[PDB]
């Protein structure tokens, strides 16, 4: 009976909660208390990247740590030479409501998507001099909110149809559809080894998925409301989530629980972007109150602030060699920090 | 000071900036609008008329170009999204106006429309965004009230103690009952509007039938007023 199934679900959920309660023998604070506080970090706007007409929702660093793709709601992707602030490419988009972008690890492609429900893929390195649309991937019902290239032929898209998908770029069709969320999936972070990935939705729950077997492997809870950003710790055995309940939270896949929560009483805006440094000792979060906060992830004190934008910080990305951090906001500007 | 190839790269960037300026004039001269409504709301007929008179399977957003008096307008309605709305609505915090279409002749889904309007008005990102609400399907409301079968007092009890405002302007010559009813619906929406505006955004009411050909002119007039208010605030005149 339906009552029987519901009772079984409650029983298994209680069993999971009990196992999680048993496994938590010490807080990360209790063990992280020994260590010295990172100290205040002062990061300064080394470069300011002007040229976007409207607000920015997305940015992705290149694996060469110098090029930079940025997505604005005016209908542009701009590829910056971050060292010299030159504009390398200016890619006009077919749908202006872009709200994600990715930069292929090889550097031959970038992706973008938004309210059009499409993940368009752009070919940067053509024999002709221009940047052309390589493929348009269709099949999601809700909007696209994040995309991440696994290699030059496989991309993973999260959507607001409660579904993340894995695509074959050569043969447009989907290869795996990841179902199990009950709200809009907002962010997405591929693991370093690219065999797994996590996605946070609008149901306050995040899930570690399996790219090859196609099935959700874990589910994590603890947030009070919908999750806006997610990112892997450089280890690959953890991830941090920022949500509209004004908190960041650090889950761990092996313990399958929550480790620490990054919150302050005076901060009531929702986190919009989360990214780590190389060591993982600094958790950088972009908030709605126009400032990105820097959190010492091991002990959850506010390490620093990066307050320079004139409107909310929508995107935030740390480069692969850890040299710089870039922040894009709704004031049409990108800021590179050291 | 820097090499030949770097000079040529800087020249390329300067030409890109020149193109971005040329795109900025056309971006700043076109006005973006968001069209919202329900299934019964006649927003599809409105968009069809605005498309025809003036100027792809799971696509998540549609676009309509029209221009009135040489001023260009963009109108977007969502096509394939889910019922949840709190996240994709944030993308429209800088549109000129939100065109909110509501069916006035239902009486059963009208409280749902009022709730949707109150959510839109009070949204933390849709503040400073004025709403041009089209109280649609006026003739259905008229024939419904004359027929007398369905009682508006049972869904809305305060209508019994409601009297037509003195500012009312029933133009064609209409039964006072329908004028009273339609101004009651308008006053519900306008109490929601004036509860918490704070003078930063306005609500422009319009009694509309989807057949009407003057919707684009209404949008143009209201957008002119909105931009005028913004220019007042920006040019220090208040």
């Amino acid at each position, epitope marked *: 009976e339906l009552d029987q199934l519901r009772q079984e679900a409650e029983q298994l959920k209680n069993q999971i909660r009990d196992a999680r309660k048993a496994c938590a023998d010490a807080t990360l604070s209790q063990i992280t208390n020994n260590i010295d506080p990172v100290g205040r970090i002062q990061m300064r706007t080394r470069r300011t990247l002007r040229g976007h007409l409207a607000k920015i929702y997305a940015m992705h660093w290149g694996t060469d740590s*110098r090029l930079l793709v940025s997505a604005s709601q005016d209908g542009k992707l701009i590829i910056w*030479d971050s060292y010299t602030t030159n504009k390398v490419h200016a890619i006009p988009l077919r749908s202006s409501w872009v709200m994600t972008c990715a930069y292929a690890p090889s*550097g031959n492609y970038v992706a973008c998507g938004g309210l059009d429900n499409i993940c368009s893929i752009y070919n940067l390195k053509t024999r002709e001099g221009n940047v052309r649309v390589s493929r348009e991937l269709a099949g999601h019902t809700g909007y696209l909110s994040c995309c991440r290239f696994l290699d030059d032929n496989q991309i993973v898209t999260s959507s607001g149809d409660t579904t993340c998908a894995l695509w074959d770029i050569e043969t447009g069709q989907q290869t795996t559809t990841f179902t199990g969320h009950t709200g809009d999936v907002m962010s997405l972070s591929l693991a370093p080894d690219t065999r797994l990935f996590v996605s946070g939705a609008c149901d306050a729950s995040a899930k570690l998925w399996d790219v090859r077997e196609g099935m959700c492997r874990q589910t994590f809870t603890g947030h009070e409301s919908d999750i806006n950003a997610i990112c892997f710790f450089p280890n690959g055995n953890a991830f941090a989530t920022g949500s509209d309940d004004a908190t960041c939270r650090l889950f761990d896949l092996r313990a399958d629980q929550e480790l620490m929560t990054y919150s302050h009483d005076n901060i009531i805006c929702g986190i919009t972007s989360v990214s780590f440094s190389k060591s993982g000792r600094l958790l950088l979060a972009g908030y709605d109150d126009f400032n990105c906060n820097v959190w010492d992830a091991l002990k959850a004190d506010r390490a620093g602030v990066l307050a320079g934008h004139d409107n909310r910080v929508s995107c935030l990305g740390v480069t692969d060699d850890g040299m710089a951090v870039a922040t894009g906001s709704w004031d049409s500007f990108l800021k590179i920090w050291n | 000071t820097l*090499s*030949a190839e770097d000079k*040529a790269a800087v*020249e*390329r960037s300067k030409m890109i900036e020149k193109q971005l300026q040329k795109d900025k004039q056309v971006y700043r001269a076109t006005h973006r609008l968001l069209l919202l409504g329900a299934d019964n709301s006649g927003k599809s007929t409105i968009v069809k008329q605005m498309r025809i008179y003036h100027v792809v399977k799971t696509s998540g957003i549609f676009e309509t170009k029209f221009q009135v008096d040489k001023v260009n307008f963009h109108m977007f309605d969502v096509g394939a999204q889910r019922d949840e709305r709190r996240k994709w609505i944030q993308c429209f915090n800088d549109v000129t106006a939100i065109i909110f279409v509501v069916d006035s002749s239902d009486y059963n889904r009208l409280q749902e429309a009022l709730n949707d309007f109150k959510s839109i008005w009070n949204n933390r990102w849709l503040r400073t965004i004025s709403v041009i609400l089209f109280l649609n399907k006026q003739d259905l409301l008229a024939e419904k009230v004359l027929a007398g079968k369905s009682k508006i007092e049972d869904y809305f009890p305060e209508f019994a103690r409601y009297t037509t405002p003195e500012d009312a302007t029933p133009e064609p010559g209409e039964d006072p009952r329908v004028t009273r009813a339609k101004y009651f619906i308008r006053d519900e929406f306008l109490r929601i509007s004036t509860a918490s505006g704070d003078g930063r955004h306005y609500c422009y009411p319009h009694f509309t039938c989807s057949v009407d050909t003057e919707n684009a002119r209404r949008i143009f007039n209201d957008c002119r007023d909105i931009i005028q208010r913004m220019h007042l605030r920006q040019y220090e005149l208040l």
Partner: single-chain antibody
Amino acid sequence: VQLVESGGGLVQPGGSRKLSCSASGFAFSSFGMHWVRQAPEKGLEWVAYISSGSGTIYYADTVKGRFTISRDDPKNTLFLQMTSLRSEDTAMYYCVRSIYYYGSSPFDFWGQGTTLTVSASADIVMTQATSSVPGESVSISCRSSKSLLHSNGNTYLYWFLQRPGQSPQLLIYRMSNLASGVPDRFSGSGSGTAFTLTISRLEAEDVGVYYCMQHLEYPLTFGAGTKLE
């Protein structure tokens, strides 16, 4: 991509000619294009340069007022105007395509060339001392006067291969980067003044003349050429 060029022939001295370069198959307006010439049996020589947007124009010290370079983007052609032709202007003129941004490969395409016949300083000099040399390994060398390594970290040295019957093709740009389509056999290296190109295993299609080029500062000087037989 293809660059077909025309407008050359027998010319009486003191006359004038206008060369053209009709381009098809690429975004012409975003490429800065050069004219390069070579005397009937000698090495290549740079002539002029016009930039994207037509805002930067350079000329050789030997054509500084005699010549005039101009482009027509909507008509998608490249022109070179020549006045007061002398007997040192007998050469085949090449149309070269070059785009400049981070990571780009300038000089990556060369046109087939046009022949022009005329009847009867403080710039970097690069010398290829060797002038001649299947399945073996060859190590064509090169040398320069001023160091080519810039403060950017780039070493603006280019390698071109001219097969016995057609136009040069780019093999290596900025001393280390193999161009698109060149096999993995070719590789380049250097230090700032002395450079080398390595072919790991020859083939019957690797025979020709190897030319070097510097892009550090205009004019672009080339080098005599190394022959493989």
